[PDB]
Amino acid sequence: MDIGINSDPHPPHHHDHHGHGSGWEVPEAEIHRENPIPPDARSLDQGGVLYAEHCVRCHGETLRGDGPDAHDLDPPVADLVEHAPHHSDGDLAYRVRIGRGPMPGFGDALDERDIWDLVNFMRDRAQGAALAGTNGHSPDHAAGDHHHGDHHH
């Protein structure tokens, strides 16, 4: 007989949950297309200096984000070790090489050889942190909580 609100002027439905996690602009195609990474200690160590030369002074060597001279710098920094498994190789290699300008874009500051090292040390470190059994959340330090699997306890 009488309608209070007719359904039509509006569309069927277009509700989204936005993006959660990183958010950085990086085409999935650049993230998964080319990434030459040599897996060694030198890539880890030397790759560890790349970021440590200038980036650690604000947020940890690479993943820790413990920052040594960040006390005067902007508010506390995030922990990349927790977000590392969330970031792919092409993405970090893509950001270090092309970046945007402000912070990333060290493709001219570093070489590809370094870029893979930056990718190696973060990739190795982030993984070593997973061993502790924290991947997916915070690290548990409760003794006698681990599942079946001791080996040298």
Ligand code: HEC
């Ligand atoms: C302070 C003087 C900084 C210097 C020098 C560098 N970065 Fe930085 N970076 C800084 C802040 C405050 C933040 C925000 C972190 C937060 O808590 O929100 C960042 C962040 C990044 C990120 C993003 C991390 C992520 O969660 O995805 C990247 C990839 C990054 N910074 C890279 C980077 C590099 C390569 C630098 C050296 C060349 C570098 N930063 C220096 C502060 C500062």
